[PDB]
Design a protein around this ligand. Structure first.
Ligand SMILES: [Ca+2]
Lengths: 41, 41, 41, 41
């Protein structure tokens, strides 16, 4: 069981990195939206 | 036991990231709605 | 320990629901983007 | 033991959702970039 819980920890850390990559993309999308809005106005 | 505490820690980290992700997604929605109103018409 | 692992399961399910709410918002944003692009073109 | 299998199951579910989330985020980025090019100029 000990070995399965270690695998789980590794996988959660992996998912965090994936969510991090999402967050960077969201930050990009927001700035691009803001720039698009500025253009319009 | 120590493994489980690690699992808990990663989960707490995941929650914080998901909340930040949610905040940014809302930012995007607000901007998009604002852009759509501008264009139409 | 058994009780801590049950708490963890509940929390993961909770996070899933949160991620689900994000996914609905993403689906909305995409359709709104598509509609905005159509207008422009 | 059965608790841990439940944890694993939820984690597998989380991965699938994160991947779907990523796919939609990319869709948004592509559309946004396309919209920005259109506007400018
Ligand atoms: Ca988004």
């Amino acid at each position: 069981i000990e070995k399965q819980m270690d695998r789980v920890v590794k996988e959660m850390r992996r998912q965090l990195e994936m969510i991090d990559k999402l967050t960077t993309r969201e930050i990009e999308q927001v700035e691009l939206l803001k720039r698009i809005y500025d253009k319009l106005t």
